Design a protein around this ligand. Structure first.
Ligand SMILES: Cc1cc2nc3c(=O)[nH]c(=O)nc-3n(C[C@H](O)[C@H](O)[C@H](O)COP(=O)(O)OP(=O)(O)OC[C@H]3O[C@@H](n4cnc5c(N)ncnc54)[C@H](O)[C@@H]3O)c2cc1C
Ligand SMILES: COc1ccc2c(c1)[nH]c1c(C)nccc12
Ligand SMILES: CCCCCCCCCCP(C)(C)=O
Ligand SMILES: CCCCCCCCCCP(C)(C)=O
Length: 513
């Protein structure tokens, strides 16, 4: 019952924190609300699936903390399948393709699309990773929704529609719901558009053998009985020098420091004393979670592979259940599966259906999309609705509605007295991700170790050596990607050379050429 540190939450962020503190000889108790660890990562194990991640799954280049943390725990990664053709499903029609983004054949649409990604990334360049509210344009951009920005950026309908999907896919919410400032920041802090969206050399490159649930399971092993499951913290009281923590079953723990390692929306329910600053209380009640239902469809045979598809479908169609999928076949070829997400508005919609109506609907879309009736004969179906996770609030992460970032956002990871705040939402790189959970756990641990006098100020924020197993190849854009004009830019240029072609006709008739 008496510890130096209590960590509230045994997600990756909380366990990381607890694991670091333990290395330093500090006593830590982790108080985990659920009957398991790992939080928004959850590897289910039954004999239908062997194992499957129903929560966070993927890792890739530049995600150095999670790779290092997982490697040290004896967890191996494997590459996501992209040997075959990706597909785009738009307007009833399936378009196979290669590369990260679907091809845009229409020349004007192409300039639009191209300019959209470059502009997302250039606008990002201005946003400080760790102080987005300090952006030169923070106030202006934070007032916009991402729908407004997209519609301001994009002339074509294709580009707009796609960009709205891009939003859904990344922040599992609707572009009208999210600040353009926060969204530009969110893609920036994941490496940019190409890194965030890609499989190869991107955030979706890899998965863990045996599941990402294992990152948390094994740290809980190392911590032994220093991790208590079924202890949701309901009160935290730092009035006196021993902080008193109370759990839902009325147990009391005391400690010198607390690391809050749960998302904002759950932070918002803890009864703190003294009360948190009023900015902070506003902040943490105004960050909603996104909406995802992760659905895994199992088949006997990876029939998509026969048709030369990898199982990655980018599904751009309002009435389709799923938005995006990946092959989820086991690394040795066994238990073939498609992983699909139901995202944003569509998740809230679909969640009101029965499971077997959701199943049926997904199989039908897949038959349609992959053009094969074999899609209608799944051998098993696994799903997790994160909207209905009481100790998660939703997935993958919190979004910032317009206004919130410049109004209350500065204090997102500021300590309140001896309470330090971890959780992926407070990470500055790959925040929203398992990677950002580790950055944030280890940095809060270090904030506590600085307090205990065991680590210096300089040492709180430590950069991760690059993984040698999964190194980061640099994202490059072609000459044409860099320099093609936006639609609007075309018009400017064309006006300049219709004009001048005219003057070369004035000069030619005058004969002064
Ligand atoms: C469907 C899904 C897909 C995603 N895909 C990916 C992916 O492919 N790659 C990736 O990197 N990330 C992905 N993410 C996000 C990733 O899962 C999270 O960013 C990461 O797990 C968050 O870690 P955390 O430690 O910060 O928070 P959490 O994992 O939420 O940990 C919080 C912990 O606190 C507990 N808790 C809540 N309230 C209390 C309380 N009051 N007291 C005590 N404990 C409490 C919870 O039970 C939980 O165990 C996804 C998440 C989901 C749900
Ligand atoms: C471009 O194709 C995909 C496939 C899966 C994901 C994706 C893009 N972006 C994702 C994110 C941000 N999280 C989980 C899965 C995916
Ligand atoms: C002046 C018109 C602009 C020219 C650009 C058109 C590019 C289309 C072909 C590239 P893709 C392989 C389909 O992405
Ligand atoms: C003068 C206008 C015509 C320009 C030709 C268009 C070339 C597009 C190729 C696209 P990428 C090779 C992927 O960057």
């Amino acid at each position: 019952h008496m510890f130096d540190v209590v960590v509230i939450g045994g997600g990756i962020s909380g366990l990381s924190a607890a694991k670091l503190l333990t290395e330093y000889g500090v006593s830590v108790l982790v108080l985990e609300a659920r009957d398991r660890v790992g939080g928004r990562t959850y590897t289910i194990r039954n004999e239908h699936v062997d194992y499957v991640d129903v929560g966070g799954a993927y890792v890739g280049p530049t995600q150095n903390r999670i790779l290092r943390l997982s490697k040290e725990l004896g967890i191996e990664t494997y590459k996501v399948n992209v040997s075959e053709r990706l597909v785009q499903y738009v307007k009833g029609k399936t378009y196979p393709f290669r590369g990260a983004f679907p091809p845009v054949w229409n020349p004007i649409a192409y300039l639009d699309y191209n300019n959209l990604w470059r502009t997302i990334d250039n606008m990002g360049k201005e946003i400080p990773t760790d102080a987005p509210w300090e952006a030169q344009h923070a106030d202006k951009w934070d007032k916009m929704t991402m729908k407004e920005l997209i519609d301001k950026i994009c002339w074509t309908k294709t580009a707009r529609r796609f960009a709205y999907l891009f939003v859904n896919i990344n922040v599992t919410s609707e572009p009208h719901e999210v600040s353009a400032l926060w969204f530009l920041w969110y893609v920036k802090q994941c490496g940019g558009t190409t890194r965030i969206f890609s499989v190869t050399n991107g955030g979706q490159e890899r998965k863990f053998v045996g599941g990402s649930g294992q990152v948390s399971e094994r740290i809980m092993d190392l911590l032994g009985d220093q991790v208590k499951l079924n202890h949701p913290v309901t009160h935290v009281d730092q009035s006196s020098d021993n902080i008193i923590i109370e759990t839902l079953n009325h147990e009391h723990y005391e400690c010198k420091y607390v690391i809050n390692a749960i998302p904002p929306t759950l932070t918002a329910k803890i009864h703190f004393r003294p009360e948190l600053p009023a900015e902070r209380n506003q902040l943490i009640q105004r960050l909603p979670m996104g909406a995802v239902i992760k659905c895994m469809m199992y088949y006997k045979e990876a029939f998509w592979k026969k048709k030369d598809y990898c199982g990655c479908m980018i599904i751009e169609d309002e009435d389709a259940p799923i938005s995006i999928t990946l092959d989820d076949t086991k690394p040795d070829g066994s238990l073939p599966a498609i992983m699909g997400f139901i995202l944003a508005r569509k998740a809230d919609r679909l969640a009101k259906l029965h499971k077997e109506i959701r199943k049926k609907k997904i199989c039908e879309l897949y038959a349609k999309v992959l053009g094969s009736q074999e899609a209608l004969h799944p051998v098993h179906y696994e799903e997790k609705n994160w909207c209905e996770e009481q100790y998660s609030g939703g997935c993958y992460t919190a979004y910032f509605p317009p206004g919130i970032m410049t109004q209350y956002g500065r204090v997102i990871r500021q300590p309140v007295g001896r309470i330090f705040f971890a959780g992926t939402e407070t990470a500055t790189k790959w925040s929203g991700y398992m990677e950002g959970a580790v950055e944030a756990g280890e940095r809060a641990a270090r904030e506590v170790l600085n307090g205990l006098g065991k680590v210096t100020e300089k040492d709180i924020w430590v950069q991760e050596p690059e993984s040698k197993d999964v190194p980061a190849v640099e994202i490059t854009h072609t000459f044409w990607e860099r320099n093609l004009p936006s639609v609007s830019g075309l018009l400017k240029i064309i006006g300049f050379s219709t004009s001048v072609t005219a003057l070369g006709f004035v000069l030619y008739k005058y004969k002064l050429l």
